[PDB]
Amino acid sequence: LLGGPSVFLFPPKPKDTLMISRTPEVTCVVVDVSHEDPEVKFNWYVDGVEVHNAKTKPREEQYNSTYRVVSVLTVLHQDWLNGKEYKCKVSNKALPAPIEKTISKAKGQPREPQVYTLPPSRDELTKNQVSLTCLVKGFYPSDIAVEWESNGQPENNYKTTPPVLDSDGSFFLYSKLTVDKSRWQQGNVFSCSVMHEALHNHYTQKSLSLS
Amino acid sequence: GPSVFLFPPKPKDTLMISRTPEVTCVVVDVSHEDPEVKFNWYVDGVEVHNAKTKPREEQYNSTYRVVSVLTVLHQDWLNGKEYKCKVSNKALPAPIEKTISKAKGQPREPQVYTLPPSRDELTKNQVSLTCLVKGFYPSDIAVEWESNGQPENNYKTTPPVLDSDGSFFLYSKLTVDKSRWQQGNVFSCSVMHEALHNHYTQKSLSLS
Ligand SMILES: *[C@@H]1O[C@H](CO[C@@H]2O[C@@H](C)[C@@H](O)[C@@H](O)[C@@H]2O)[C@@H](O[C@@H]2O[C@H](CO)[C@@H](O[C@@H]3O[C@H](CO[C@H]4O[C@H](CO)[C@@H](O)[C@H](O)[C@@H]4O[C@@H]4O[C@H](CO)[C@@H](O)[C@H](O)[C@H]4NC(C)=O)[C@@H](O)[C@H](O[C@H]4O[C@H](CO)[C@@H](O)[C@H](O)[C@@H]4O[C@@H]4O[C@H](CO)[C@@H](O)[C@H](O)[C@H]4NC(C)=O)[C@@H]3O)[C@H](O)[C@H]2NC(C)=O)[C@H](O)[C@H]1NC(C)=O
Numbered sequence: 001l002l003g004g005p006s007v008f009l010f011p012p013k014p015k016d017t018l019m020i021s022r023t024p025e026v027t028c029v030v031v032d033v034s035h036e037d038p039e040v041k042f043n044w045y046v047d048g049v050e051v052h053n054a055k056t057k058p059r060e061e062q063y064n065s066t067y068r069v070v071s072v073l074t075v076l077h078q079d080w081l082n083g084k085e086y087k088c089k090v091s092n093k094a095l096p097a098p099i100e101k102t103i104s105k106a107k108g109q110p111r112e113p114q115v116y117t118l119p120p121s122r123d124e125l126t127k128n129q130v131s132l133t134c135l136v137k138g139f140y141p142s143d144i145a146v147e148w149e150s151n152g153q154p155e156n157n158y159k160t161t162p163p164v165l166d167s168d169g170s171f172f173l174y175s176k177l178t179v180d181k182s183r184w185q186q187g188n189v190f191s192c193s194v195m196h197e198a199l200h201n202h203y204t205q206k207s208l209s210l211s
Numbered sequence: 212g213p214s215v216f217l218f219p220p221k222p223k224d225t226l227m228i229s230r231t232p233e234v235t236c237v238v239v240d241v242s243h244e245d246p247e248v249k250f251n252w253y254v255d256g257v258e259v260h261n262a263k264t265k266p267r268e269e270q271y272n273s274t275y276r277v278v279s280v281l282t283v284l285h286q287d288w289l290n291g292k293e294y295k296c297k298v299s300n301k302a303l304p305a306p307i308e309k310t311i312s313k314a315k316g317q318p319r320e321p322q323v324y325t326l327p328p329s330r331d332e333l334t335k336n337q338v339s340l341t342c343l344v345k346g347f348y349p350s351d352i353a354v355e356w357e358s359n360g361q362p363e364n365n366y367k368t369t370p371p372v373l374d375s376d377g378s379f380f381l382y383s384k385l386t387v388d389k390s391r392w393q394q395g396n397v398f399s400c401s402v403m404h405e406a407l408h409n410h411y412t413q414k415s416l417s418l419s
């Protein structure tokens with residue numbers, strides 16, 4: 001067993017913090033836990049105050065002679081968005097000092113996304129499929145969710161870039177929805193929907209159809 | 212002990228014969244006691260000798276960073292040769308080897324579409340000019356903006372994104388004062404990619 005345990009601490013998904021009916025979680029994963037001595041303790045802290053409601057799962061033996069152990073802390077939506085810091089401490093007797101990782105929403109003043117839908121380029125109408133573009137810019141923090149739909153139903157064939165840092169410190173991204181050109185030319189309405197903390201009710205939709 | 216990371220040349224540098232593409236073998240966490248690192252480089256398993264080791268870069272965390280740089284032939288890289296860097300150091304029981312090469316597969320020509328600012332953005336002081344570059348392979352690409360022969364400073368480009376068909380797309384956003392858009396200035400999105408004729412294409416964007 002040459003080596004030592006490593007800790008990864010994962011944030012909630014952006015959609016989960018923004019919808020009260022969803023369940024946002026912070027997840028602490030410890031890997032390379034000693035095969036011979038796999039007992040691990042977790043301590044969790046929120047703004048440095050210890051909390052006791054995390055759910056720690058049974059350790060899972062890996063194929064490389066190590067264990068992996070996960071502890072899941074359900075967070076309050078408003079705690080996350082109000083910038084509370086979540087600390088996971090992991091102790092193990094084959095480890096000379098506990099390992100601590102901390103995570104929180106990115107620091108800074110939230111900024112409201114501007115959302116702009118862009119039709120296919122005229123050069124594109126040559127093709128059997130066209131691209132409908134959603135530009136979302138000016139937003140902060142980078143935690144965001146983007147989706148497309150038409151007639152109330154989610155569209156399958158879209159891809160969204162990661163947030164990119166802009167020159168003013170805000171973020172932008174684009175979402176591209178691919179549709180059969182026929183669907184565009186018939187005047188079907190498509191909608192880009194954006195979920196972000198700095199939108200009213202955390203959500204806005206911009207629509208797009210043939211002019 | 213030390214850790215090795217091997218980096219590919221810049222997309223622009225492999226596509227233009229006058230530019231100098233380099234593969235860079237970076238060694239971190241070399242101790243203060245043994246900054247001595249040896250480098251061997253191979254191209255499809257055959258030793259090459261043109262690598263240059265840059266002077267050791269001392270770091271805040273009590274280690275060195277040592278970099279070896281290998282100039283490559285544009286066509287070797289585009290033809291998919293494997294570049295192997297082997298690193299030997301006293302703090303390493305055995306040498307560490309890393310290999311890098313261009314992504315494998317039939318290259319595919321980027322389609323380049325310029326999109327004007329959304330009508331809703333026209334209430335702003337600055338507007339967004341969009342260049343959609345899609346259907347390309349491999350993901351290595353360079354994108355720049357120009358107007359009246361001259362580079363535009365104020366743009367950001369997304370990384371390549373894997374599309375549903377296994378090609379890549381990205382978007383480039385150039386921001387300009389609304390006045391310049393409204394005045395009929397012509398802006399151009401420049402794309403360099405191996406699958407393009409002469410490795411380069413441009414598309415213009417204007418109010419018109
Ligand atoms: C022995 O085996 C284990 C288990 O592996 C499994 O079994 C073996 C036998 C094989 O069969 C494996 O194929 C098999 O999977 C090995 O365990 C792995 O250990 C490595 C580290 O050595 C871990 O790598 C880290 O991975 C995370 C991302 O992890 C997510 O995504 C994985 C798929 O991409 C997925 O497999 C993971 O489970 C995990 O999934 C996420 O799970 C959360 C919680 O459940 C969930 O909510 C998410 O939705 C889900 N995500 C996805 C995509 O599914 C990665 O983040 C780590 O990167 C950080 O650390 C690096 C340094 O270690 C660094 O280089 C990176 O840049 C990055 O750094 C962080 O970056 C952020 C932002 O930039 C920054 O804020 C942070 O500060 C910074 N972190 C710091 C402080 O360093 C990292 O790459 C694997 O997750 C882990 N696998 C599993 C399954 O647990 C083990 O290595 C083997 N041991 C030996 C000796 O060989």
Ligand SMILES: *[C@@H]1O[C@H](CO[C@@H]2O[C@@H](C)[C@@H](O)[C@@H](O)[C@@H]2O)[C@@H](O[C@@H]2O[C@H](CO)[C@@H](O[C@@H]3O[C@H](CO[C@H]4O[C@H](CO)[C@@H](O)[C@H](O)[C@@H]4O[C@@H]4O[C@H](CO)[C@@H](O)[C@H](O)[C@H]4NC(C)=O)[C@@H](O)[C@H](O[C@H]4O[C@H](CO)[C@@H](O)[C@H](O)[C@@H]4O[C@@H]4O[C@H](CO)[C@@H](O)[C@H](O)[C@H]4NC(C)=O)[C@@H]3O)[C@H](O)[C@H]2NC(C)=O)[C@H](O)[C@H]1NC(C)=O
Nearest residue numbers: 214216218219235236237239240270271272273274276278
């Ligand atoms: C002591 O200090 C030094 C110096 O650190 C610097 O200063 C300190 C004070 C801090 O501020 C640091 O944050 C800061 O970096 C430390 O050295 C660092 O060591 C880490 C690992 O511990 C390295 O991490 C790797 O980074 C590469 C990316 O590296 C580029 O980007 C960085 C900025 O994002 C940049 O700082 C780097 O210099 C480098 O920049 C590039 O340089 C080349 C060459 O010149 C140039 O051509 C490029 O243009 C330039 N790019 C730029 C500017 O962006 C990252 O890719 C590595 O990830 C791989 O490996 C991880 C394992 O550690 C793994 O988790 C990842 O998933 C990923 O895995 C690989 O992925 C590839 C494809 O994705 C895949 O094929 C492989 O399977 C897989 N390989 C595996 C598993 O190994 C990795 O994160 C830092 O680069 C390095 N910093 C510098 C400047 O060298 C040192 O660690 C400190 N030690 C301590 C704490 O004691």
Ligand SMILES: [Zn+2]
Nearest residue numbers: 034035036065
């Ligand atoms: Zn064992």
